[PDB]
């Protein structure tokens, strides 16, 4: 569970000291200096004679405009953390203000502690200016390479979903979530405001949304800055916030006056948050209006007002760099020099080039520092789940009635297993669902917890399995469910979410961003300890969206995940739940795993169980296994065709083909693939089957009929250097189907049992088998026509049970 | 340009007639009956004795919950259309409400006109009930197979972005956009509300957002129905709307009282909209507060209140079917029977089983009808653009100074072309961008038009190229820009939008849904005329996101688009602008095309021009071409290695390697690829190169070093059955990068000129050249180290120019 840190939710009951405000002004000035320094200077960090164009970097890379805003807020939060003892994690929505985040870590000690080459002196300061956005150095964004970051803010939108995910089951945590006014125009951000009706002020922590209303994005004004202030206040009140507005920097107000006004406001907001936390110990069933801050300041605040006659402070022109070159001319250099000097850095550094003690007297210390809080390195907090014994959930009927038994919905097994995981691991595991948890059959969870809901209740006849506190959360937003969970994993907890397969694509770019976070982490951030895996149950899949139709038929998250399977990072897993027992096998593996995105493709429709838990655990360890109990060939040399499947529905259609081939006395091998990446090039992936193991399973020379769950392109591109790759006949989804019958969905994509039988005969001998093939094709047309006439499927398709099932026995 | 249809923005100046309201109530009842009928009945549409469980469908497919509220709004909108002559297109957010849409088109005559087997009698009604969500039949959603749909609503969120796109440069058009209250929880919808400060009430039409506040989604309440009414109204007011709220169905109020309250409310809202349209002819610089309607009715309205002792009307339980089976028992069939009879069909149908004249007297007529308005079949409005002469934008310098000239930003060329397409086609063409138009270099457009901004103006020192009216729109939302444009295309207009390549993935799922829309259309909807193409400029790409870092480095939109390339549909284009000329070649083709998504991948970084417009146009027609002027081999037998590239940067590094292999006198073919899909199996894609043409270009039997823009898996999967496929050595992006130098970006992905030369040498003979291979590998490290020391790239990299150029 989340640890309690410091003294949470304490009022100051005293005004902020003048001496501490002086510290903030100094932090502000030095953080600006270090920010400009990282963008502009390759050398000579303290500007000692001779200070020249040779000291400036050749290409300017990085973003000023947001940075002085961020540096002002982070200074005042640091003051706040130290005076109060508050467990604080920030979310920098504008992750392109990465200089503010590196500056914070350098000034709080965590940078030097983590990178000992980057010392607190002139030499270290020069290394630090240089390395920013620089070949062999560090990113331009608040990247995972930065102490205090759980949010890079490269792809904008996820500021508020991440903030709200971080505070769940984290009642000591406070998250000032800084949101760009451009980022507020994105869809994911717009709906993230609404998260305040899915958290509880007693069992969850608190988010203080801060709107960085600097008036501009790259090249345009922001919508929220150019509407009336009355509209802006109403909008935030209507979304269940008590909005406060701070305006500064548009006039001649002295910097100390601004600091006084801001600390006074901030303490007022904090007093209101402390009243909320205090009330919540008594009454947590009444949703309060959570404070939020509208921070209205000119973009690029404290850069030159005009440069070469164009307004730069309080404009979009300050967004990247207000001054496009300091090398090209002397007058441009003159502006950089005067700009850096306006911060009077002779008052901020000692003669060693260390920051003076009175610039940092006010800073927090130890684990309260933004860079050091374990919430921002959640791996240090994370423990292994207490897993119940997998064998308790095994479908046993396979062991006694035979392979292919039953009409079970596989996901109900993951449902029961996950339920007991929540019971044994309370406050450490969450399920998220875009109004689909029960549709994907995971509602066994409601037996030990509730959907968490902090909007209105009206009636026991409709408000079932909801409570103001609980470990299932639903909102109809794939962005919120991915967001919440990601932050939940990043602050050191566990969980899963499910989605209908086609709508996973809604959050393809979040999967990309979270993969990239994990890629950089496992490659070059050994101090960032492993977090729990992002477990995604991909259900209600293409082959059984016959009832919703073509809009819902897109299994291609598989193709998108394959684009993050490089470098032996091993941050992606892609599993095909053959049946409920293989679903358990995959669930154990993913629930124990760390630093991954696990995509678990599994059907909720009634389907046969093929494997015992033992056979499934064994098949999963290698990724593909031959099925000697289903093969009629005794070894590879006797086999005329290999039948291979990846996916519950292709396994079903391949095993019903197998039975038709057995009755014609064909000699076939049956292969099953649970782990897509097992087939990847052994040159590319050191966990894949070797060519030796590949050749043995799939044979070196015999024709392979491969029925794949998703698009053939996936498998064909994976196996390009494998033995016998030219003999793979891959069937998959081909952008066909409609509102139709289960048989029609497989038929129209040329993966039904009859076409697979036909295909197997074609591959052995078209001439020898020409007759049976024609019979098989006419039956396909006949089976379709049966559906059109009757409105359900042919009994050959419906009433089929694998020959291996002892159906004599009344079970 | 959009047509003016009917008599727009007309007040009634009279109460709604008692007789129209009675028509409306009959529309609601029959429409509900047709709706339940489609979900539950295989036969006996009018329940003529004997009426048994043999008449009910075995598998119930479809959604009742939303459907009665939809049938109510559309009855009332039908009344309003006829009484006012208002050009009206509806957006059914809750697309799962398919039955309200099919019912609409049956009742207005467009269904029987489009589908003549579906007659206005017992026999047709039997076909109409059965075919719904039935094998052989029609979809469960407001699909493109339905007259009146420009919006399926299968994937929720896109209701307001499509609504607002439809009304742009469409001043006579009115779009009531029906938004689910579940759908309002999605991100794309949340931001769509704000579209009201990007439209002008004089040059654009009007959207009336309608929140279907029915209190529930599948298995949960909705946030927006369980917050205070005060918070709900502040929320809409703060997004610049005048919220109006209608509550009905929670008590015993009689249907006719409900209809009267509703029409009166609807006309009061209509008057306010007409005042806004009249004001806008004099003052169109002050943004009005646009009405919206909060519609609060019980989910499943008019279904049985309780079923098996569980609450069904005003519950999530009504979402799909309130009554799970009608065949399992007689008690369940009895419930179905009683429910159908509650509507009193005996009053609605004559003995032929045609709908009675006095049910449809109130309905609009001709092109004012929801199913026949040409805005909902925009291909009939669509005209070919007046394109300017491509030759006028040619980079002519290639012809004078040679292949490899200059350091031009290619996208500036597409920017000039597009500017003049706007000048020649005013009100027919729009650019959208997510705060990136200028960054992607399309700002030549500002020479003839402005960014359209209907929020506040403060100062000429910051408000450059903005006007309350204009053909460029920007909001920082990929969903909005994709949304606006889709609707703009579907109502018969043209355009383009640009994104940074990594952030195209934000809208992967929208390209999926549009692709599927087009896929359904070219296959089986010949009455839906072709629309203009969704043209997406994919720029600021992976190889030159070295100033922003790993977050901006994902070119895998290519992999996603390849998943919509089957059945010879030809609804996807994937193109790589080799240079500005090849970009013009691709733009012309894309701007003349219909029924496509076109992904145009082009660099905005300074880069060489390789091709004349003529060689560009000839290369593009085939999709790939040998570059004989760059090859040293003069036929394929004489060739030792083939150098292939797709992408401005791969092309650059392959042409630099070619110059390095020329110095060693290797005999190599150079191939450029501009159209990814030309490589697709000839058995799969009938527009692709033949095996003949493929083996001629790439050779039958020699080693091919292919440098690819995106992920090598793309190509490896495309060419599985091409001859000589096993000799393809494919390098592409490999999830390596950082914020670094151009050289470092290609180096760390093994696509830099030096590695590509080495790899060519390895593939001809690793021993012969081992010395020269090894030297190349050390220069890679030397070149990296240079950049670390100096902070800019080694001049062998920086300063190179193709031997083919005159540098004197
Ligand atoms: C989803 C997405 N689209 C586009 C971009 C490109 N981009 C980066 S910064 C930016 C403007 C953001 O402005 P704002 O949120 O106002 O931040 P600030 O002004 O504080 O820099 C844009 C469009 C992005 N990072 N993410
Ligand atoms: C993006 C997306 N996520 C999830 C779904 C699954 N889904 C289908 S309809 C629906 C509920 C929508 O409820 P609402 O919008 O309130 O419609 P209504 O109550 O009018 O039926 C859900 C979750 C979807 N279609 N699209
Ligand atoms: Ca901003
Ligand atoms: Ca609803």
From TrEMBL, chain A:
Amino acids binding thiamine diphosphate: 66, 96, 154, 156, 182-183, 214, 299, 319, 503
InterPro entries: THDP-binding, Transketo_C/PFOR_II, Xul5P/Fru6P_PKetolase, Xul5P/Fru6P_PKetolase_C, Xul5P/Fru6P_PKetolase_CS, Xul5P/Fru6P_PKetolase_N, Xul5P/Fru6P_PKetolase_ThDP_BS
Residues that hold phosphoenolpyruvate 1 according to the record: 63, 439, 441, 500, 548, 604
Binding site for (S)-malate 1: 63, 319-320
Residues noted as binding phosphoenolpyruvate 2 in the record, renumbered to the chain: 63, 439, 441, 547, 604
Names of required cofactors: thiamine diphosphate
Binding site for succinate: 63, 319, 439, 604
EC supergroup of this enzyme: lyase
Binding locations of Ca(2+): 181, 214, 216
Gene3D superfamilies: 3.40.50.920, 3.40.50.970
Enzyme Commission identifier(s): 4.1.2.22
Residues given in the record as (S)-malate 2 binding sites: 63, 319, 500, 548, 604
Domain Xylulose 5-phosphate/Fructose 6-phosphate phosphoketolase C-terminal: 604-801
Any one of the GO BP annotations: carbohydrate metabolic process
Pfam families from the UniProt entry: XFP (PF03894), XFP_C (PF09363), XFP_N (PF09364)
Family: Belongs to the XFP family.
Protein name: Xylulose-5-phosphate/fructose-6-phosphate phosphoketolase
Gene name tied to this protein: xfp
